[PDB]
Amino acid sequence: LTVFQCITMEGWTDVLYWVNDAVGRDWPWIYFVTLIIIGSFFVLNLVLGVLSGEFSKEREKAKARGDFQKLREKQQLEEDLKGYLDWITQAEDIWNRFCRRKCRAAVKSNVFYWLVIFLVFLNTLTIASEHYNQPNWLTEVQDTANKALLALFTAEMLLKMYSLGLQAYFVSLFNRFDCFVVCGGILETILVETKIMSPLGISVLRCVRLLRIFKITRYWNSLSNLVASLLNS
Amino acid sequence: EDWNSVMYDGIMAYGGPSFPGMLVCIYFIILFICGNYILLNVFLAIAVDNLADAESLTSAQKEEEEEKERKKLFRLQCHRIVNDTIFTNLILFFILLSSISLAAEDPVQHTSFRNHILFYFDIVFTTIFTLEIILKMTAYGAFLHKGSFCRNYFNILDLLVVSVSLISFGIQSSAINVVKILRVLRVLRPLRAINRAKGLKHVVQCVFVAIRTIGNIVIVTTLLQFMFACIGVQLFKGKLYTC
Amino acid sequence: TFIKSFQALPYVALLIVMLFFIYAVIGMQVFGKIALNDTTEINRNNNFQTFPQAVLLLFRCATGEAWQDIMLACMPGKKCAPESEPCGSSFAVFYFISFYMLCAFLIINLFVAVIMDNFDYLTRDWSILGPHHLDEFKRIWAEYDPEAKGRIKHLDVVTLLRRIQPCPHRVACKRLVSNATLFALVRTALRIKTEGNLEQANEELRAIIKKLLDQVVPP
Amino acid sequence: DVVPSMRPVVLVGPSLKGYEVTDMMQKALFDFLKHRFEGRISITRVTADISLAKRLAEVQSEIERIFELARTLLVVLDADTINHPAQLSKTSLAPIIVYVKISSPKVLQRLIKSRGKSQAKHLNVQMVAADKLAQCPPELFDVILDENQLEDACEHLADYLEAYW
Amino acid sequence: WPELLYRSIDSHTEDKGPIYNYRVEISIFFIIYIIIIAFFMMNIFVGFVIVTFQEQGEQEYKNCELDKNQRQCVEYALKARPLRRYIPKNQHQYKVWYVVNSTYFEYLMFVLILLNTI
Ligand SMILES: COc1ccc2cc1Oc1ccc(cc1)C[C@H]1c3cc(c(OC)cc3CCN1C)Oc1c(OC)c(OC)cc3c1[C@H](C2)N(C)C=C3
Ligand SMILES: [Ca+2]
Ligand SMILES: [Ca+2]
């Protein structure tokens, strides 16, 4: 039992200090130090190896099951719709609606992309600047800053709703996510305005606002495949 | 975490340590051994099978549908560079002995009978390694000759450590608190051996390349961990005090 | 295989050694003069005073054993050592956090490096013939033949120890007809091809794969 | 035979021209051609049949007026009669025919369902036309419209239009 | 962890002392955090290194050649060396040599050592 506790590495040091106080400090460490390295690390390395090695068998076996092939089908499939749905929008515009061309042109423009990124950067400061006893003015700054950022984020969200096809906007997974958070922010304004908030409400309603930080890491594809593969499984 | 505290509470519940009681350890050993085996399978299978598919897309779709979208289509004379072979192993000895020199200094004894003895060993090593600083002048570099010295930053580190030791003696006469930190930075001696050991250079270089690839993962965790901290602050913004 | 692999990757294990030494020295000095006392983590049995003691504390924090409690012990404002003739540091928060991250990462690199360099055995279906089969073939041959006394000397089927895993349908007799024997089984145990030209095709493979004596390879 | 001083440009779309879904796919495409080939390109819109050409009464004058524009010294011809390279193989006017493709037919249903439910049930009448367009080898399959977006798909038309001009 | 968990559960209100098990629902926050970062994300990083190293390892994939089983096997072509056996020549030596080399002797000793530890 005493040996087994050491290998789990909890209480490992306490017994060592109860032995150093009985037979001196010189030799005893070799028993426990070698026990952890030989007992814990190697087996922890072995167990990791076989588990990692074994799953290569199933992963190789799963290749014949076409899990990647089916997954690849959805990825290319759903990607095309967004590309093809662009044509219809680019053609639906050949009551004057020539301004709709201008609004779309900004959506894909670099200036618009970084503008929202900066807004997301500000939103982090609004929330990250919490403090146990904030100055009485800081709460007002966070109060106004939260509201102002909420209007801009929804204001540009609606822009994409009209600039891009309503059905087209919901095609992309990320675009679906943005509606979820921005919709959640609206509840906060109503709940805070009407004084019907609950301790449960503020937590998640705060959490959604933080999730807007995921606006960052959009170009990056390493994480995109993780989530895409993750959702399939 | 406190796997022990729970066990001993369980054992004492069934009397003291004896034969009839004390067998409840079987429940805790079963729980930990069987419990931790499930977590490895569930989370390694999730993190390997799904991860393997994700990178497969990153290398299958990205590689080929971009192959197709692109398939759309001073004195320079009588210098002595000799003796660089024996010094190869010899220098590694001084670094090894120099590191041990600072591994033996006693911190607690301000007026130590040993630090003064060690202080001399720093002199000999400091003087010895300053010789190679002069030697490097003969070789291409010295911020000159197309910056041969600046093209190998690993060799620059050799100078910085020597300069750090040299600076310490100058400020030692002043007997000022500044030297308190300068001494700490001298610990960089062992890394000096990296530039000289061919087999070690590959390992340390391989570590950096890994970090560059990992950058796509650690960056995600930092945002995720920071996201939890932001939630954490709201939940417990100073409610944890206790008289 | 694992013990063998650790030998093939010594320099990686040296890197983790350098991490302990570098951090042990830094901790040895900045937190050298902390006041020892019971009821606190920095006590008679834990302290950055002697190098062996410091490295053990670094090892202690490596396995995550109340390391966070030590981090609070080295924070500034702690009484100083009686030897000193107000004595801690605030570098601890970075010191222990940085060590655990770096130590945890290098151990990960050390663990995975051994796994991958030994990935052949770990992922092996154990159905196709492997090196183990050759070794047990040597032992029976060795028991069937002492030191360097066998060239052909084959007139009996006592070498029947081969089970289903590489006289059913007389294939053994045909295989037997087709170190000399050792190469014979491998070229036919996997059954690379059956076209009446494997030797000619394989005779052109060992030429490019290779070096050593080739007057026994053709057989 | 003899070049009619021009290489008329026509577009079959991914399916029957009788519906709106195919129509929008090209109106945007046509626009970019005339904004980057000022004068070089000309556009013609007709509603009669061209298959019955002898190298119905209205079709008699259809070829000449197309030729009349072709005499002015590309020309884009828009018609609802061509649904397969065979329809234009009956005459040798050196036409250039461009094909819109949906590599996976599964995309069509999502696209068709989006515009309106009235024509959603007509996917069978439409998806079939796409299949008919998936049997012509390169020879009757000259122009390649495979990429989804426009900016990187339209440019694949201009480069093919530099063969002579 | 548990010391903080039970100091967080006993959290009444901002700037106020603790109340025993005021809100045990808060444990969801720690359990969710433990699973996500400590267990899940930590495994992704471990899995990523294993896969990333595999790309480096398979740099010399050489798809043209056949499986790696041949690589070991052909490299084993230099095998089949003499192995020390030294069958006894003296009749007296052979008697003891057979029994000690007997499978019974190997199994018999394993019983003794097991008893020795007992
Ligand atoms: C300083 O280096 C280390 C110090 C301490 C430790 C490991 C160290 O190195 C590693 C080696 C291998 C890996 C990660 C780290 C990878 C390994 C692993 C190991 C691992 C994980 O928990 C977080 C998670 C993972 C992810 C999956 N794969 C399989 O270790 C565990 C436990 O898992 C069995 C555990 O039970 C759940 C409890 C503890 C620990 C560690 C041990 N400590 C901190 C505390 C308790
Ligand atoms: Ca613990
Ligand atoms: Ca622990």
Numbering used by the authors:
A (entry chain E): 354 to 447, 509 to 647
B (entry chain E): 706 to 778, 889 to 943, 964 to 1078
C (entry chain E): 1400 to 1484, 1494 to 1574, 1582 to 1593, 1607 to 1638, 1647 to 1655
D (entry chain H): 222 to 276, 297 to 314, 316 to 407
E (entry chain E): 1137 to 1254
From the paper:
To explore the molecular basis how tetrandrine blocks the activity of CaV1.2, tetrandrine (10 μM) was added during protein expression and purification. We determined the tetrandrine-bound CaV1.2 complex (CaV1.2TET) at 3.4-Å resolution. In our cryo-EM map, we found a well-resolved triangle-shaped density in the central cavity of the pore domain, which is well fitted with the tetrandrine molecule and positioned proximal to the selectivity filter. The two major moieties of the 6,7-dimethoxy-2-methyl-1-benzyl-isoquinoline ring are positioned close to the DII−DIII fenestration site and DIV, and they are stabilized by forming hydrophobic or Van Der Waals interactions with surrounding residues from the selectivity filter and S6 helices. The 6,7-dimethoxy and 2/2’-N groups from the isoquinoline ring form hydrogen bonds with the N741S6II and Y1508S6IV/N1179S6III residues. To validate the binding site of tetrandrine, we designed two mutants, N741W and N1179W, with the potential to create steric clash between tetrandrine and the binding site. The curves for both mutants exhibited a rightward shift compared to that of wild-type CaV1.2, indicating that these mutants reduce the sensitivity of these mutants to tetrandrine. The derived IC50 values for tetrandrine with the N741W and N1179W mutants are 71.3 nM and 41.8 nM, respectively, which are higher than that of wild-type (~14.2 nM), further confirming the binding site of tetrandrine.
Its α1 subunit consists of four repeat transmembrane domains (DI−DIV). Each domain contains six transmembrane helices (S1−S6) and forms the channel in a domain-swapped fashion.
